[PDB]
Design a protein around this nucleic acid. Sequence first.
RNA 1: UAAAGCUAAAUAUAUGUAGGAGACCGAUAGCAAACAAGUACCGUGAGGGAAAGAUGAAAUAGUACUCAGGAAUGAGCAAUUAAAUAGUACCUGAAAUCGUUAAGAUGGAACGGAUUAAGAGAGAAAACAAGUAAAGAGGGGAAU
RNA 2: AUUUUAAAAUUAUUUGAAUUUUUCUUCUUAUAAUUUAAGUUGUUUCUAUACAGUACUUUCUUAACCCACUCGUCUUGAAACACGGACCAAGGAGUCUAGCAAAUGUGCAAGUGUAUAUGAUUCUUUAAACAUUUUACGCAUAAUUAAUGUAAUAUGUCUAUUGUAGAUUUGUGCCCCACUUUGCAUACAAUACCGGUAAGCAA
RNA 3: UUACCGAUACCAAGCCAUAAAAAGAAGAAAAAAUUUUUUUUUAGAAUCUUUUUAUGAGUAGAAAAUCGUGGGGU
Lengths: 125, 52, 47, 105, 186, 147, 52
Amino acid sequence: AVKKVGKIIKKRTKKFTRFQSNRFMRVKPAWRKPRGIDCRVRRRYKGTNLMPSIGYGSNKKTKFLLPNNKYKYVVKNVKEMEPLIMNHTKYCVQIAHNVSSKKRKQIIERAKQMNVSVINAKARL
Amino acid sequence: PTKIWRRWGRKVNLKEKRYAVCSSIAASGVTSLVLARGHRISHLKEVPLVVS
Amino acid sequence: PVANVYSTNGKNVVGEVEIPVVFQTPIRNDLIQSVYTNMSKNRRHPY
Amino acid sequence: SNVSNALVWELTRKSNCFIKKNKAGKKGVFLCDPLNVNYKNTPSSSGLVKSNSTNVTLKDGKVVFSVKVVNQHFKMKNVEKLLQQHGSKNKEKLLKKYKRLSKLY
Amino acid sequence: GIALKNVGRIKKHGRKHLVSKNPYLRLLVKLYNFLARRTNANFNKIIAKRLIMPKRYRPPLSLSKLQYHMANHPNDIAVVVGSITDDKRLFSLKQLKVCALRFTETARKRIEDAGGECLTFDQLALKYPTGKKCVLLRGPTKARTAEKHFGKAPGKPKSKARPYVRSKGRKFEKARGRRKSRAYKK
Amino acid sequence: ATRFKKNRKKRGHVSAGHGRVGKHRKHPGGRGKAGGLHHMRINFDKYHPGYFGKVGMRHLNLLKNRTYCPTINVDKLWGLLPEEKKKEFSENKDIAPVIDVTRKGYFKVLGNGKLKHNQPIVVKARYFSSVAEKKIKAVGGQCILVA
Amino acid sequence: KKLDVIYGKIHEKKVTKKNYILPKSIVHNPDIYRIIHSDKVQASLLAKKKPC
RNA sequence: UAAAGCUAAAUAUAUGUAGGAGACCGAUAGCAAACAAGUACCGUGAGGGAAAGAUGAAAUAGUACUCAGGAAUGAGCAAUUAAAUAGUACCUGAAAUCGUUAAGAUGGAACGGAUUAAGAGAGAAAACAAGUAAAGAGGGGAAU
RNA sequence: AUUUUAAAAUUAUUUGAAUUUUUCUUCUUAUAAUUUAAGUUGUUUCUAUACAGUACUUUCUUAACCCACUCGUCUUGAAACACGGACCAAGGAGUCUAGCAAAUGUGCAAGUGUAUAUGAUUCUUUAAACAUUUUACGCAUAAUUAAUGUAAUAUGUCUAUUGUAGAUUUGUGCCCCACUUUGCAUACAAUACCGGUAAGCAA
RNA sequence: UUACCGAUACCAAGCCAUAAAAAGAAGAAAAAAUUUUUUUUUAGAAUCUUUUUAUGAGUAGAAAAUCGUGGGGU
C-alpha cells in the first residue's frame, strides 16, 4: 500500500522481485522483465508478481529526499563539503564507505560547524 | 577471434586537423576555458602568457 | 589585441606583442573532440 | 569577435573540472568554480561565465575574498569595506555566506 | 476505453532539436527561436526552423542563382540558411547584400570585390530583427544525386530512377528490360 | 563503437530481433546473386532492369589512353583565368585572351552555356564541338586547333 | 610571433602553411544576449505574454 | 632481334634465434603447456593428449613443552607471528550441499500475489525544545 | 515579486431609478470591509517536558481472508498425457573485414581526397604528430550510342526558357485581412536543345 | 414491481510518465524574541523553468532514455 509521512508519499514499498526467484536459487530476486510466450506475469494474470510500471513513480516535488526531508550527498573529504554551505538545510551529508577514521572525524566536525546533518555519523567508532 | 586486420588507425582530413589545431590554440587563449580544463591559473596575469 | 611579454624573472614586463590572428578562430569543442578521437585512434598497437 | 559569455557557458556547461554531480542522490549538481557564490551550475552564477563577479571562500584554513583578468585576492568589517569598494541583494548574500563561513575552524 | 486515433496523442513529424553540437550554431538557434517566439515574424519562425534542418535540406546556393533571385529587388538582402558557393560560369557580380550560414572563400572574395558584403545570422538579427527588406532564399533541395535514385523503382514503367550499378558501359545493366530487342523495355 | 550497436539493445529478448517464427537461418534464399531469373526475379526486374543478356560488340583490348579526352564547356573559358584579368580583357576592346585549354587539362570544348556578348576570345584545343565553334565565332573569337 | 607567419600573415616560403585559410566563424559575434538587449531588437519584440 | 648464360638493390618472411613494445589475456582466460608440458596417461599403430600457480615480511620464525592416547590425533595454564579460523589441502574463501544452537510452522505438496495482524530483531538522519546564564575542557579569527 | 487581480457575492453607510411593493426586491453612485470570490483553515489535547522502550519507523518470521497450475519453446491452440530443465558456480552466442547505399554530424566546395613516396635539430612516448617549388590518381564537374563517334536555348543579351500554385519581400486600405509587388524550394505541365532510333530530303 | 450487490469499464480528486500546448534570457516575505536581534528562504540550468489539457494493453518488430562490466585518455 501507499506510505505517507508528512508531504512525502511513497506510492509502493516491498520492491518488485523477479518471477520464480522464490523457488529457484539460480534466479536472483533482482527484477527482470519476463519475455516468455505464456508467462503468467507478462500476461498479468491476477495474483502473481505484478511488474513495475511508470505509474508507481513518486512525485517530482518530493522525489529524492530522505525521511529527514532533504537530499543526500556523499562526500569523500572535507573539500567536497563546500557547496553545502549554501544549502545546509536542503542537503544532508553521507561519508563514503572507503573513508578512514582519520578523515571521518574531520568531516564530522566540519559538518557540525557547517550546520549540516550527517547520515552515518557514528560509523567506525 | 580477434584479427590483426581490424581498422586500427583512422584517416582524418587535413583541413579538419588544421581546424582542430587552430581551435585548440584559440581555446588555450582564453582564461575561462583554461581554468575549467583543470589548471590552477588564478595567479596568472593573462592566459595567453608569453615569456622572453 | 595585445599581450606583453614577461621576463623569466617573473616580476617585470618586457615588450608587447600583437596577438596572432590564429587566436580568433572558432573554439569548436565538438569538432576538436571528434578529431581527437579519430586521431588518437592512430597510435594504437595491434592485438 | 571569437568568444563571449554565452559561448563560454556553451563550452563549459557539461565538460568542466569544477562540476560535481550527485550520483548517489540524483537531485543535485554543484559547480565549485572559485568565483561561484552559490555553487549552482548556472550561467548566471558560474564565475568563469560571469564577466565580473566576487565571492568569499576559504583557502588552506583562511577565509579569502576574491574579485574578478584582474583576479584579486584579499583577506567582517574588512569584508564589508572591500565589498563596498569592489561592488558592482548579491551583496547581502555575500555577507551571509561570509558570516556563516567564518564559523569554520 | 476511448476510441481515438493514435490513442489521443497528437503526432508531429520532423526535427524537434538541432542535432549538431556546434556551439555557435546552438547559440544561433537559441537566439533565433527566441526571436521567433517573441516577435510575430513568420520570417523569424522560418529561419529558426531552417537552422534546425539536416545538411541535405540546406543545400548550397550559387552566386548565379543568388544574383538571379535578387535581380528585381536590388536594395534588399538575400537571406539563405545554406552556404553560398562561387559560380565560375558567372561573368560578373553586382553589389550583393547577402546573409548566409557559410560563404565559400571564392564566393566571399567575389562579393567583397563586387562591393556587396557577406553577413552572418547574428548580424542579420542585429540589423533586421523582423526581416524588413530581406528575401528568404534556398538552393535546390531535390537536385542532389541521391534523389535521382528515389521515386518509382528503376524498372517500373516510365521510371526515371537512376539504378545502382558498378559502372555504365554497354555491358552493365543495359540488355534485358532496357530495350525492346531483349524481352521488354522498362 | 560496439556499444552503439543495435544488437546490444536486444540483449535479453531471446530472438535477437530476428523473429520467433521465421528465425535467422543461414542463406535461406541462396548465396550471392543466386536466385536471379528464378525466385529473386522480381527484385532483379524492379531494381536492375537490364541486368541479364548482352548487347554490342567486343573491344578486345581497350587502351583507354587512346580515347581519353576531358571536356570543358563553353561557359567556363572566361572563368578559367583570374578575375582581374577578366576585368582587364573586358574593358579593353583591342585585345583578346588566348586560352590553351589543353594546358589546363581539357581536350574537347563543348558548347553548353553563354559567352559574353561582343567579347572576343581565342581558344586552343584538340577538339571542338560544332556549337562551341559557332558560339566562339559569334562572340567574335576564333577556335585554334592544336595537338 | 612565428604563429602569425605560420598561419598566413606575413607569408614566408618554407614556414607558412601554403594556401591555407584560417577557418571562418558562422557568427560574427557570439554575444547573443548583447545583441538581444540591443535597442533595435528590443523595439521589435512585442509585449511579454503570460502562461496558462 | 627467339631458339645460350650471369647479375646487386628496392620485395617477402604463421620458421629458428635475439632484442623492444602493446587501449591484448590474467590460471575454465592467454600457446596444448605460467608448474617435472608435448609431460602423465591412452591406442598394435598412424596418432590422441591432460590436470596442476598464491603460507608468511621473515620459516636464517614451518609449530618447542605438558597432558591424554598403541598410534593417528586432540587439548592446554604452553608456544612462533602483527595474525595460525595464515599450520603446508596453508591469500581471500561465494553458491550448491551438510552440521550445531535458537525461534517458529506442521490434517494428501511447498513457495507465492494483495491486505493487515501478532511476535522478534534492529533504529533517531523529520520522528520536540533553538537560544539564555553559570562552570570545565578545548579549538580558531581579528585587533598592537 | 507587476491577474489569489479584476469583477462576483455579502455586510455597513450612500446616489437615482425600476418593479413583481420589499426585514435575502432588483439595477448603479460612491466609500470601507469581508468571502459565498481567489483548490483548508482554526482550537484543544497527545506524542512529551524523551533521547530509543512495551511507544513510533523499518526489516524478518509466522498466521489469517481473497487470489494464485512449471518455466523456456515450437505452435491457431501448452498447466499439458508436447520437448529441455536434479542443484550450484564460472564460461556461453549478430562480431570483424571488404564493398555499396541511406541517414545524420563535420570540413571544404566545382571541386574534393594528398595515394605511394619524400623532408625534417621528431625519434621513450614518436608505429604519431608536422609538411608537400605556382596538369600524378580516384570520385565529381555531361550525356548518349553496339559503334566510327557526336555532345546540351544562342550572340539577339553579364539577358540567366514559359506557365499555374507557392515561401519571403514591397506599398494602400507598429498589432487583421483584401488589393498590388516580388515569385525561393517544390509539384504539375509546356517548351527548346544534346545523344540514339524512326520518317522526309540527301553532293 | 422495487431495493440491493457487483469490474482493471464510467465519474470526481491526487500523483507518474507520454504527447501537445500557454509562456519565460530580478525584487523582500513571513515567523519568533526585544525600535534591535534570531530562523527559513530571497529562484532563472532553453533536451531548462512554471503552468494547462488529453492520453496510458500489447507477441513478432522498431526506437529513445536510462543501469551496469574489462580497459584508455582527461
